[PDB]
Structure 1
Amino acid sequence: NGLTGTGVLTESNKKFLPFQQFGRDIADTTDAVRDPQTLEILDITPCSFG
């Protein structure tokens, strides 16, 4: 719903507050999202590069 990105999506085990959509890291990069339809938190990592 607006957040455009690339990466691997994985089942999370963090717990947002029930009004927060996505989570950010220190140095400010999106690293978690919440799926709008099912409302579950998913981690996002950078595609296996190097």
Structure 2
Amino acid sequence: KCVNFNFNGLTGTGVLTKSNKKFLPFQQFGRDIVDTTDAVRDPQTLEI
């Protein structure tokens, strides 16, 4: 669902879906070839 998300201070708008991206434990968010945020990590559930 398209919502305004505030992930640990990171403010944005969009729809959050389950991700096949496998973040390494130290990685907190993912970016795209043009430095656009593609993925995030949930502070509570540690979900990508």
* Pairwise TM-score range, normalised by the shorter structure: 0.7 to 0.9
Q: Structure 1: how far apart are the matches of 2:15 and 2:23?
A: 20
TM-score when scaled to structure 2?
A: 0.77
Structure 1's consecutive aligned runs of 4 or more residues displaced over 4 angstroms after TM superposition are none
How many residues are paired up? 40
* Structure 2 unpaired stretches of 5+: 1-7
RCO (CA 8 Å, sep 6+): is it higher in 1 or 2?
1
The structure richer in strand per residue is 2
What root-mean-square deviation, in Å, do the aligned CA atoms of Structure 1 and Structure 2 show? 0.7
Percent identity at matched positions?
A: 95
